Amino acid sequence: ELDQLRQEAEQLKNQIRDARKACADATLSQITNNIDPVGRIQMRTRRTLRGHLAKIYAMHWGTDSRLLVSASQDGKLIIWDSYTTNKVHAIPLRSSWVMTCAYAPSGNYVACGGLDNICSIYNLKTREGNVRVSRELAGHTGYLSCCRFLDDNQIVTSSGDTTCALWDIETGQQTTTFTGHTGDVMSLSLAPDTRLFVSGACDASAKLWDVREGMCRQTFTGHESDINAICFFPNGNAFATGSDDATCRLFDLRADQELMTYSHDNIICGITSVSFSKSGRLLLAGYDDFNCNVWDALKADRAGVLAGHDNRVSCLGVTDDGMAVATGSWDSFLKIWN
Amino acid sequence: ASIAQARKLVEQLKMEANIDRIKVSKAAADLMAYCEAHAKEDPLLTPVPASENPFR
Amino acid sequence: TVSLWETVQKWREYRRQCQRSLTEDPPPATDLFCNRTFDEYACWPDGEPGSFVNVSCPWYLPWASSVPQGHVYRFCTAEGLWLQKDNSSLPWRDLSECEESSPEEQLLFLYIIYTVGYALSFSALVIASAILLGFRHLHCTRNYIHLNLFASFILRALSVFIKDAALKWMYSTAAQQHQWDGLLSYQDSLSCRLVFLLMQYCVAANYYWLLVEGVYLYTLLAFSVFSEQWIFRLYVSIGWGVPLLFVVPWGIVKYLYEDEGCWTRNSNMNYWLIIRLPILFAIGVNFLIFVRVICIVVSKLKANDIKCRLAKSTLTLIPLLGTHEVIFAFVMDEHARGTLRFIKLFTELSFTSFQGLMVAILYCFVNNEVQLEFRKSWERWRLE
Amino acid sequence: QVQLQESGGGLVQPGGSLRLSCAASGFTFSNYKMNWVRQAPGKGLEWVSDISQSGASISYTGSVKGRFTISRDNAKNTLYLQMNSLKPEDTAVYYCARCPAPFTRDCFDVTSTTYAYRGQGTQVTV
Amino acid sequence: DQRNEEKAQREANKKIEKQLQKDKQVYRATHRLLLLGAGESGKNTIVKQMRILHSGIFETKFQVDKVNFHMFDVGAQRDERRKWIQCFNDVTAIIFVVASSSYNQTNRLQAALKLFDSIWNNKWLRDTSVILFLNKQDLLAEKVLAGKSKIEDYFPEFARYTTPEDATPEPGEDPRVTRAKYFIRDEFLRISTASGDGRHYCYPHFTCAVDTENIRRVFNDCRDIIQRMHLRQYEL
Amino acid sequence: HGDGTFTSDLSKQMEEEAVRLFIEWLKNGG
């Protein structure tokens, strides 16, 4: 009976909440109250990367912390040298509606996708020297919201068809499908060991997936509206989510519950993008009100603000070496901050 | 079909039920300890002098 | 009309024959006679003692022709000397027959008005130009056209301040004393002529940037889509370069045929048409653009209190195109006389002087985009 | 966790009233615009009524005008639908749906087939 | 040395700027359109007629008076639109196609009105104009002339509604057909005249799926959209 | 334009004043 199954899930639901409540000794704020505040974090715009015609949804830093790729609705992928502000590549896209971009860790490939429901793979290191499409990964029935390379042959994609997919780029096939979300999957984040990844969806929940087993280990609730952004904490044992409910939250994997909420009464707009600093002490979040807020990840205090962009801050990225932050925006500009 | 998603949903909750959860204070300590162990190598946390700052 | 240079030439001519008369003329052969002299005004032949001495009005006078039957008289007696003025050394003389023969205040009223107007327009526009340049988010083709228009207004005001000073340096106590002596003055100088050549270019350039403002706004609404780069090149070229096509020929014609008075007095009105007609063309075309834009505005308002919005729109659009000129523009200089001339000059000078101030207010200071920038800059600094 | 629980449904003869209650939890109830939607047998989801954050602005589908009234109590986090003079074609499963984002005038997707912020409806048969 | 590298990098950067400037001229010369409609709106027939006169998303390109139009039609996306609708915040217009005969899914027209309300009042679409196609006009006329429609059953306000004086009936149109037409338009204009605030505009049109005037209707609304934007920038 | 017409009228007015002053000077024996 459907009602019997519906009740059984509800009963187990209560047990998981009781199990989570049993492990709640003290709040992270109680543990952290003796820590010194980080103080006022004052960051300035060191660079403004100009050249995109339309708004930017996505940027991704290279593992060299110097090159970075950005995607604009004008149908362009632009690879920047952030040190010199010189453009290295300008890749025209077949579909102008691009929603995500990824840079491979090796630096040999970039990926992008959007409303065409395709992850396009680009070879940056062709013999002829011209960037060509390596693969088109088809099989998602909804738009791609996020993609992240594992290596030159594997990439993980999240889609508006409520699924995540792991692709073998050479064959162009889905080796694994990750199902269990009921809303659009908006963002994904690989663990530092790339054995697991987390996704945040429009069902206001975040799920932890095992890549090789292709199954959901854990589901995280606490947000009220759609989750737009997600990022692992540097040690890989926690992650942070930004939502349309105008809050950021930190979830601990092993505690299996929400750990802290980042919000203020003056903030009534959703978060579009989140990222940790190199040590994870700072949580940076892009907002709909054109600003980025720097949070003390341990104390839930706004340490600072990035206030340069004239339109929606859509995307965020902190370099691997922790030197700089990039903000992409709907005003078609990339800014670099220290 | 509505029953079919229900049984699949219950089975998923079975896996999430049978997990080991550490204590939140223990979890809070690990994140606290991690940030302290990496505070000095965080360029945004500690403003570096304008000699090894590539954007300066 | 007669000039100071032409007058001193005739007087110095007059002195030359008179000094010949004081030597070439035979002696009167009669003793105890009033001796022939020459004051700086009239040449005095010697006369028999006891009666009047008759000499006509000096012919170097500009009004000498208007008094052909004029005669300066002088009286000497058997004393053998002229009778000096009472309690004075200089001899007596009667000159009522050859006597010399408000536009000033109205033109002073006018000079005060536009000098104040141009100064306030100059001050507001340099502030407004900084605002548009300061905020990078305000950088667009529309504000680039506006900035060039601000420069044309600023250059026009500056050329007026320099022009007014040049007229003073040309009619100073030293300048007069130098042209009296026949010595070279500021008026002979070539820097004098390029000052009033600078006025002609700067005024014409401002008119043609008002024309470019209308033409650019027309293209946006005519729905005519173009290469925005080539468009801009043609627009800067017209705003700054097209006036050179008729201002340089005016200076060439002035230098060859009417090189007098530092190119200030419009003696031949055909030569003054070289600058006026191209300006009238810019004024007339920009007035047609004005009509066509208001016709577009009324159609939009009819679709979605028409009058108050149409009024705000018409009043704010007038300074951007300078359509207050069309009222008296077709009333030519040759025919504006009396109170008609004053009213024509007053509107043209007063409205145009404050037009730069108007434009600086309506297109930079009340501008919603400009106001948004200072609000968020205040908000950004408030977050520090 | 966002949860909406509907109650008060039943079997009623035509012309008889029912009062539906929606118990809300897991979000700030006062920040959201609430909705009522139905799904008749063999048909799609149909929007019935909505109420703003404070309860001031109210809308109905034309078929229930002057017949159904929507009410919210922010203090108790409850949504109400008092249905009067029911008709046989009012027979449906009634869902309490929440608008997806807070503080928004627009309300997207509440009638979608797999909308998340919707309860498991209560059956109403007339 | 390094100078050879950095000069090479600036040499590569100028080829991109040269190409990006060319791409900018084409991008500003094209008007992008989002075609939104329910499946039974007649929107697919509309796309087909324009195709003869001249996938997660379908694109068609038509040219009217040497003006480029790029129309995008959603395919293979879920009915959840609250995320992917934000991609079209900067199109020239959203072409919203409505089946006007669909009041008798119980009430497709009420669903179309709710969708239009969400589009009109979304914060990211505040500046986006909507061209409204009231499509099934031929079917609306045939239905209301038969007497089986009963619009009052789905919209009780239709009992007291009167045809506006400014209505321009087509030749031979029954007043009942004219009255039913304008009531549904006034349903959409009640939403549009609230919160429009002179930033975005609604252009309703009584269309049919096979109208050849539709591309001209879109062209004339786009030029009106562009002209209103320019006049706003000049504070006129 | 008005600037050119104003300047022309002012220069003729000043020129005649300088001409009159030169004659008014002569009668003073300059």
Short mmCIF file of all heavy atoms in Angstrom, two decimals, chain A residues 6 10 13 182 202-204 221-226 244-245 268, chain D residues 1-2 5 26-28 32 98 100-103 114 116-117 120:
data_model
loop_
_atom_site.label_atom_id
_atom_site.label_comp_id
_atom_site.label_asym_id
_atom_site.label_seq_id
_atom_site.Cartn_x
_atom_site.Cartn_y
_atom_site.Cartn_z
N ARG A 6 4.30 5.20 2.63
CA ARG A 6 4.45 6.60 3.00
C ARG A 6 4.67 6.76 4.50
O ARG A 6 5.47 7.59 4.94
CB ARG A 6 3.22 7.40 2.55
CG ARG A 6 3.39 8.90 2.66
CD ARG A 6 3.99 9.49 1.40
NE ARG A 6 3.29 9.09 0.19
CZ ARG A 6 2.07 9.49 -0.15
NH1 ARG A 6 1.37 10.30 0.62
NH2 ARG A 6 1.55 9.07 -1.30
N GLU A 10 8.07 8.01 6.77
CA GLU A 10 7.93 9.05 7.78
C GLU A 10 8.49 8.60 9.12
O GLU A 10 9.14 9.37 9.83
CB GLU A 10 6.46 9.45 7.92
CG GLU A 10 6.19 10.38 9.09
CD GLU A 10 4.76 10.87 9.12
OE1 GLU A 10 3.93 10.34 8.36
OE2 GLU A 10 4.46 11.80 9.91
N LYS A 13 12.11 8.63 8.95
CA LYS A 13 12.47 10.08 8.95
C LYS A 13 12.67 10.55 10.39
O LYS A 13 13.71 11.18 10.66
CB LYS A 13 11.35 10.89 8.28
CG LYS A 13 11.42 12.40 8.51
CD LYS A 13 10.31 13.15 7.81
CE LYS A 13 10.32 12.95 6.31
NZ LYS A 13 9.37 13.86 5.62
N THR A 182 14.83 15.73 -6.50
CA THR A 182 13.53 15.95 -7.11
C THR A 182 13.41 17.30 -7.79
O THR A 182 12.46 17.50 -8.56
CB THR A 182 12.42 15.79 -6.06
OG1 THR A 182 12.65 16.67 -4.96
CG2 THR A 182 12.38 14.36 -5.55
N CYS A 202 17.13 22.21 -6.35
CA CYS A 202 15.96 23.05 -6.13
C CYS A 202 14.92 22.41 -5.22
O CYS A 202 13.84 22.99 -5.04
CB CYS A 202 15.33 23.42 -7.47
SG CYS A 202 16.22 24.66 -8.40
N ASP A 203 15.20 21.24 -4.66
CA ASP A 203 14.39 20.66 -3.61
C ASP A 203 14.85 21.08 -2.22
O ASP A 203 14.41 20.50 -1.23
CB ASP A 203 14.38 19.13 -3.73
CG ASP A 203 15.78 18.53 -3.72
OD1 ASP A 203 16.77 19.28 -3.58
OD2 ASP A 203 15.90 17.30 -3.86
N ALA A 204 15.75 22.07 -2.15
CA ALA A 204 16.28 22.61 -0.89
C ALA A 204 17.07 21.57 -0.09
O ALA A 204 17.15 21.65 1.13
CB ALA A 204 15.17 23.22 -0.03
N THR A 221 19.36 18.54 4.83
CA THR A 221 18.27 19.50 4.79
C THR A 221 18.51 20.58 5.83
O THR A 221 19.42 20.49 6.66
CB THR A 221 16.91 18.81 5.00
OG1 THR A 221 16.92 18.10 6.24
CG2 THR A 221 16.62 17.85 3.86
N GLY A 222 17.67 21.61 5.79
CA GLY A 222 17.84 22.75 6.66
C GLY A 222 17.60 24.05 5.92
O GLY A 222 17.14 25.03 6.50
N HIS A 223 17.91 24.06 4.63
CA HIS A 223 17.57 25.21 3.82
C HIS A 223 16.07 25.23 3.53
O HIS A 223 15.38 24.21 3.58
CB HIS A 223 18.36 25.20 2.51
CG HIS A 223 19.73 25.79 2.63
ND1 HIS A 223 19.94 27.13 2.85
CD2 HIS A 223 20.95 25.23 2.54
CE1 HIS A 223 21.24 27.37 2.89
NE2 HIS A 223 21.88 26.23 2.71
N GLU A 224 15.57 26.42 3.21
CA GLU A 224 14.15 26.63 3.00
C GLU A 224 13.77 26.72 1.53
O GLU A 224 12.65 26.34 1.17
CB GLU A 224 13.71 27.90 3.73
CG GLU A 224 13.89 27.82 5.23
CD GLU A 224 13.44 29.08 5.94
OE1 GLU A 224 13.09 30.06 5.25
OE2 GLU A 224 13.42 29.09 7.18
N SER A 225 14.67 27.19 0.68
CA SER A 225 14.37 27.38 -0.73
C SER A 225 15.47 26.71 -1.54
O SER A 225 16.33 26.01 -1.00
CB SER A 225 14.20 28.87 -1.03
OG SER A 225 13.79 29.08 -2.37
N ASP A 226 15.46 26.94 -2.85
CA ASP A 226 16.40 26.28 -3.75
C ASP A 226 17.84 26.57 -3.36
O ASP A 226 18.19 27.70 -3.02
CB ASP A 226 16.16 26.73 -5.19
CG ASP A 226 14.70 26.68 -5.59
OD1 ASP A 226 13.94 25.89 -4.99
OD2 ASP A 226 14.30 27.43 -6.50
N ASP A 244 18.34 30.39 -2.06
CA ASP A 244 17.40 31.48 -2.30
C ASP A 244 16.72 31.96 -1.02
O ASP A 244 16.16 33.06 -1.02
CB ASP A 244 16.34 31.04 -3.31
CG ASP A 244 16.74 31.34 -4.73
OD1 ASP A 244 17.62 32.20 -4.93
OD2 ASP A 244 16.20 30.70 -5.65
N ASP A 245 16.78 31.20 0.05
CA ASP A 245 16.25 31.65 1.33
C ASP A 245 17.14 32.72 2.00
O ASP A 245 16.85 33.07 3.15
CB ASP A 245 16.05 30.45 2.26
CG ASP A 245 17.36 29.84 2.76
OD1 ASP A 245 18.45 30.24 2.30
OD2 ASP A 245 17.30 28.96 3.63
N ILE A 268 18.16 39.88 2.27
CA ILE A 268 16.88 39.28 1.92
C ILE A 268 16.91 38.79 0.48
O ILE A 268 15.86 38.52 -0.12
CB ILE A 268 15.72 40.27 2.14
CG1 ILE A 268 15.97 41.56 1.34
CG2 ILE A 268 15.53 40.57 3.62
CD1 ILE A 268 14.79 42.49 1.31
N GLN D 1 13.69 20.79 7.49
CA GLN D 1 13.10 20.27 6.26
C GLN D 1 11.75 20.93 5.97
O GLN D 1 10.94 21.10 6.87
CB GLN D 1 12.94 18.75 6.34
CG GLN D 1 12.47 18.11 5.05
CD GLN D 1 12.20 16.63 5.21
OE1 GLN D 1 11.05 16.20 5.26
NE2 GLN D 1 13.26 15.83 5.28
N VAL D 2 11.54 21.31 4.71
CA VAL D 2 10.28 21.94 4.31
C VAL D 2 9.20 20.87 4.25
O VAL D 2 9.32 19.88 3.51
CB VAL D 2 10.44 22.65 2.96
CG1 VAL D 2 9.12 23.26 2.53
CG2 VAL D 2 11.52 23.72 3.05
N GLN D 5 1.56 19.77 5.51
CA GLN D 5 0.62 18.70 5.85
C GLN D 5 -0.81 19.21 5.71
O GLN D 5 -1.21 20.15 6.39
CB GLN D 5 0.88 18.19 7.27
CG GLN D 5 2.19 17.44 7.42
CD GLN D 5 2.43 16.97 8.84
OE1 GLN D 5 3.15 16.00 9.07
NE2 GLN D 5 1.83 17.66 9.80
N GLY D 26 9.32 24.02 8.83
CA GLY D 26 10.59 24.02 8.13
C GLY D 26 10.91 25.27 7.34
O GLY D 26 11.87 25.24 6.55
N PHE D 27 10.15 26.34 7.50
CA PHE D 27 10.45 27.60 6.85
C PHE D 27 9.75 28.71 7.61
O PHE D 27 8.88 28.47 8.45
CB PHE D 27 10.07 27.59 5.36
CG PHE D 27 8.61 27.31 5.10
CD1 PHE D 27 7.72 28.35 4.88
CD2 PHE D 27 8.15 26.01 5.06
CE1 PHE D 27 6.39 28.09 4.64
CE2 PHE D 27 6.82 25.75 4.81
CZ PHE D 27 5.94 26.79 4.60
N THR D 28 10.16 29.95 7.33
CA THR D 28 9.51 31.12 7.92
C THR D 28 8.21 31.34 7.16
O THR D 28 8.20 31.86 6.04
CB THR D 28 10.42 32.34 7.86
OG1 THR D 28 11.69 32.01 8.42
CG2 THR D 28 9.82 33.48 8.65
N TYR D 32 6.43 33.91 2.95
CA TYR D 32 6.08 33.22 1.72
C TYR D 32 4.63 33.47 1.35
O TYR D 32 3.77 33.68 2.21
CB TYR D 32 6.32 31.71 1.84
CG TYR D 32 7.78 31.32 1.84
CD1 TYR D 32 8.47 31.19 3.03
CD2 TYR D 32 8.46 31.09 0.65
CE1 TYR D 32 9.80 30.84 3.04
CE2 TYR D 32 9.78 30.73 0.65
CZ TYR D 32 10.45 30.61 1.85
OH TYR D 32 11.77 30.25 1.86
N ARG D 98 3.54 26.06 -1.54
CA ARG D 98 4.24 27.27 -1.14
C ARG D 98 4.99 27.83 -2.34
O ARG D 98 5.53 27.07 -3.15
CB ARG D 98 5.20 26.99 0.01
CG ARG D 98 5.87 28.20 0.63
CD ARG D 98 7.19 27.81 1.26
NE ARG D 98 8.28 27.78 0.30
CZ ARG D 98 9.49 27.29 0.54
NH1 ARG D 98 9.77 26.72 1.70
NH2 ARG D 98 10.43 27.37 -0.39
N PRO D 100 8.05 29.35 -4.35
CA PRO D 100 9.41 28.82 -4.16
C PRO D 100 10.36 29.74 -3.41
O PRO D 100 11.12 29.26 -2.57
CB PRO D 100 9.87 28.55 -5.60
CG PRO D 100 9.05 29.44 -6.43
CD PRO D 100 7.72 29.55 -5.77
N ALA D 101 10.35 31.03 -3.68
CA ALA D 101 11.28 31.92 -3.01
C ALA D 101 10.55 32.91 -2.11
O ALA D 101 9.43 33.31 -2.42
CB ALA D 101 12.13 32.69 -4.03
N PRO D 102 11.14 33.30 -0.99
CA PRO D 102 10.50 34.28 -0.11
C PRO D 102 10.60 35.69 -0.68
O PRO D 102 11.45 36.00 -1.51
CB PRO D 102 11.28 34.15 1.20
CG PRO D 102 12.64 33.71 0.76
CD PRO D 102 12.43 32.82 -0.43
N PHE D 103 9.69 36.55 -0.20
CA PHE D 103 9.68 37.99 -0.52
C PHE D 103 9.55 38.26 -2.02
O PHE D 103 10.09 39.25 -2.52
CB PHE D 103 10.93 38.70 0.00
CG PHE D 103 11.33 38.30 1.38
CD1 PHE D 103 12.56 37.74 1.62
CD2 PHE D 103 10.47 38.51 2.45
CE1 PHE D 103 12.93 37.37 2.89
CE2 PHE D 103 10.84 38.14 3.72
CZ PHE D 103 12.07 37.58 3.94
N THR D 114 6.01 17.82 -10.45
CA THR D 114 6.95 17.37 -9.43
C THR D 114 7.50 18.55 -8.63
O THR D 114 8.68 18.59 -8.29
CB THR D 114 8.08 16.55 -10.04
OG1 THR D 114 8.69 17.29 -11.10
CG2 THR D 114 7.55 15.23 -10.58
N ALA D 116 8.43 20.73 -5.49
CA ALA D 116 8.97 20.25 -4.23
C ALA D 116 8.21 20.80 -3.02
O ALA D 116 7.87 20.05 -2.10
CB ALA D 116 10.46 20.59 -4.11
N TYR D 117 7.96 22.11 -3.00
CA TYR D 117 7.38 22.73 -1.82
C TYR D 117 5.86 22.61 -1.82
O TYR D 117 5.14 23.60 -1.66
CB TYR D 117 7.83 24.19 -1.73
CG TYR D 117 9.29 24.33 -2.07
CD1 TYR D 117 9.70 24.97 -3.23
CD2 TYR D 117 10.27 23.79 -1.24
CE1 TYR D 117 11.03 25.09 -3.54
CE2 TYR D 117 11.60 23.89 -1.55
CZ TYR D 117 11.98 24.55 -2.69
OH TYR D 117 13.31 24.65 -3.00
N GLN D 120 1.50 16.51 0.50
CA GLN D 120 0.72 15.40 -0.03
C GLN D 120 -0.76 15.69 0.24
O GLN D 120 -1.19 15.72 1.39
CB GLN D 120 1.14 14.08 0.61
CG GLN D 120 2.48 13.56 0.12
CD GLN D 120 3.66 14.30 0.71
OE1 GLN D 120 4.43 14.95 0.00
NE2 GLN D 120 3.83 14.18 2.03
#
